[PDB]
Amino acid sequence: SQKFGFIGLGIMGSAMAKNLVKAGCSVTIWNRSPEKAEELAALGAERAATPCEVVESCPVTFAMLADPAAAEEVCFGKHGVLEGIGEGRGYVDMSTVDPATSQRIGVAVVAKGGRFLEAPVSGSKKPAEDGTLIILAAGDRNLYDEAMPGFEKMGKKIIHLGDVGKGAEMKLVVNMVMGGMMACFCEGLALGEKAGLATDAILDVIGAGAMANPMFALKGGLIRDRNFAPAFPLKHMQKDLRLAVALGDRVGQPLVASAAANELFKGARAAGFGDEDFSAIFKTYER
Template identity: 50%
Template sequence: MSNLGSSVLDATAAAGKLRVGFLGLGIMGSPMAQNLIKSGYQPSPQEVAAFCDVTFAMLADPESALDVSTGENGAASGLGPGKGYVDVSTVDGATSKLISARIKDTGALFLEAPVSGSKKPAEDGQLIFLTAGDKALYERVAPLLDIMGKSKFYLGEVGNGAAMKLVVNMIMGSMMASFSEGLLLSEKVGLDPSILVQVVSQGAISAPMYSLKGPSMIQSLYPTAFPLKHQQKDLRLALGLAETVSQPTPIAAAANELYKVAKSHGLSDQDFSAVIESLKSKLQHS
């Protein structure tokens, strides 16, 4: 099994005396767990799933999510009736359904709850939860989701939360690729790209991502909030989702190729805004 950080929290607040575990204390998981701790939940070094009433998992990819939940000594082996497992990882629907089936075989409840938001929203408790699965578990953990996020959506059956997250990240990845093209083109024709960021940020196509990422991108700096390798993974999964329903996604497919080029240039662990470097390399060789 993956050697991943974990935390156990005693919940005595609005959630009603729940013991809450958190598996996966990385860029996203750590600040999410910290927000629970700040609200009165104290960590304890215990076997997480067996000890806790509800266990959250925030893993990097479908393989890790499966391993931690259903692998040897996985969370499922510590679950049973009365317990709940909330997977906030970004995975494909098929993986989420596999995890759900294994969790429910134990008698526990399952909720998929991938989040929209990166490092800063996680630190600020401003994530958006896209949930699906057992409605009873959703209602049980709603106070916890409210601590870690600014909004939550219940989308029905398992797979819908995963699908919504992939669509959102597909759009985000394509937006960043297009933004990168614009920054480079403005500079190439003699404009000040920092002024472009201001213009874009005040118009109809304004998005917080542009004003947040633009200044550092102009300086070729990419402090990691959402690793590029994860953005490319989500684009790959979104393209696979589109394939299952024969939906054309030519823009996302083109963007995916740019992220793959960026990965080949050693930028996997940089922020996903480093995709602009893949366009610079194309320009340098044109």
């Protein structure tokens, strides 16, 4: 009987909101495109007209938006979060964004009388459905504690990393490694294909060794079957590497391999695989 607001109902946000509804929470919902909202309304969610409406009437609102532009627009725009937020009500942006953007939103939220937490996550569509996300929160400690029962229905591992920005930083670091791994993994599979190796043979050897991981296992088979249905949209992976490179720029860390990965994913977007899974980068190598 806890009440939560939820803003942004894409791949990740849709499954997360549904987990709050399945858990018995009363959930108030908003999405720029109505159709996705109409999906959860049918499940028992309450549908709000604007972001303003959601945070105007919910003690704690989660948001799961595409990128900094989306997060900023929803926050600062007409009928946005800033218009409805206040009197201690909390805004929890779980979108992957740059530390400067979450910090910017946090300040504005706090100036309106609200509280702000950032909580980017690790784990894709399936972990979102299963409620097994890893939640990387940073910011208001009281809001962290208050949002916890919500977090616990969305994730398995929930941590607090300190001041606003540290969560974004953790997320960007972790995803940079993932993007890099995926680029290299695909180069291996493509090279193997051209060398005359069977994919399953390669997958079998990797699976038996020190590099074995769930991501290689999952994506390996999907690549073999040439199924690139989006779990983590390729255009979002590229956005994340974009942000990781800007973080590197700011803190003075050269990132030769991760910058290469950024460019390769840009190639995949240009090729038209932007709305496909990020594993679709394999098709640029092949092709």
